[PDB]
Design a binder for this molecule. Structure first.
Ligand SMILES: Cc1nc(N)c2c(-c3ccc(NC(=O)[C@H](O)c4cccc(F)c4)cc3C)cn(C)c2n1
Length: 256
């Protein structure tokens, strides 16, 4: 009849394709642009109560590696011919980690100091979520962001409502059983951060190999201690993989 989203915000564009939709909308009152995730909630009533308990425990979250929350509200519009859950989140930089990485193809432009710094933020963000008994399960360059303050942000996660390149095996076939799946994703990210790429062909080919622990020799030589971690993080038996804390507490994560 009269939508909360339509009255309070004037849309700019769309950003994300749902697995729900994500718009860039200016709040008219405070005249700031935000990322607004629109979700179609489950018609099953008891599945809904679970989703709400999550937004309740999600709103609580506050961490520098986590995107800033603002407001969450519901809309039950008239069937044009269903209830939506809108979520207002801090709008991040148009250049995400994927965009950033595909702008820097030289092993120089991937300076060791900058890459370890970036990854640590991603690692710390997961430590936090893991400490709260939460798992991200959407870790990939396409869904890692920078603020207008150049601070790294682990992207959209949670509120599942029931590329697989960074997904762990058990995540691709199974129920994504353990939080370890995030550790695995971190592994491939750290690699791709350190090891540049020329083509999508190379990216896919090399990463598909690195998934099965086939590392370019140039890498293993140049970065030996990181290679130890990336192995540990990719360890094919999840239980073998380090906890988010163990990664942050490493010799490499110092001298900065
Ligand atoms: C430019 C930009 N900025 C963003 N913030 C985004 C996002 C985005 C990133 C993160 C989330 N949500 C979250 O991180 C969590 O779901 C969450 C929810 C409530 C409270 C929390 F503390 C955390 C939701 C979007 C749309 C997705 N896309 C494509 C974006 N694009």
């Amino acid at each position: 009849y009269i939508s909360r989203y339509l009255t309070d915000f004037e849309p700019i564009q769309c950003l994300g394709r749902g697995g729900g939709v994500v718009f860039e909308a200016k709040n008219k009152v405070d005249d700031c642009n935000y990322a607004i995730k629109r979700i179609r909630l489950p018609n099953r009533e008891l599945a809904r109560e679970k989703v709400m308990r999550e937004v309740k425990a999600l709103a609580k979250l506050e961490h520098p590696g986590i995107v800033r929350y603002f407001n969450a509200w519901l809309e039950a519009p008239p069937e044009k011919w269903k209830v939506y859950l809108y979520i207002q989140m801090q709008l991040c930089r148009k250049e995400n980690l994927k965009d950033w990485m595909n702008g820097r193809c030289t092993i120089e432009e991937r300076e060791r100091s900058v890459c370890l710094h970036i990854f640590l933020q991603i690692a710390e963000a997961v430590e936090f979520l893991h400490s709260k008994g939460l798992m991200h399960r959407n870790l990939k360059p396409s869904n890692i962001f920078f603020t207008m303050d150049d601070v790294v942000k682990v992207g959209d996660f949670g509120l599942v409502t029931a590329t697989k390149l960074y997904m762990s095996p058990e995540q691709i076939h199974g129920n994504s059983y353990s939080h370890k799946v995030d550790i695995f994703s971190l592994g491939l990210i750290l690699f791709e951060l350190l090891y540049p790429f020329s083509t999508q062909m190379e990216r896919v080919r090399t990463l598909t190999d690195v998934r099965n622990l086939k590392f370019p020799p140039l890498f293993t030589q140049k970065y030996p201690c990181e290679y130890v971690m990336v192995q540990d993080m990719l360890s094919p038996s999840p239980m073998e993989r380090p906890e988010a804390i163990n990664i942050i507490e490493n010799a490499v994560f110092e001298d900065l």
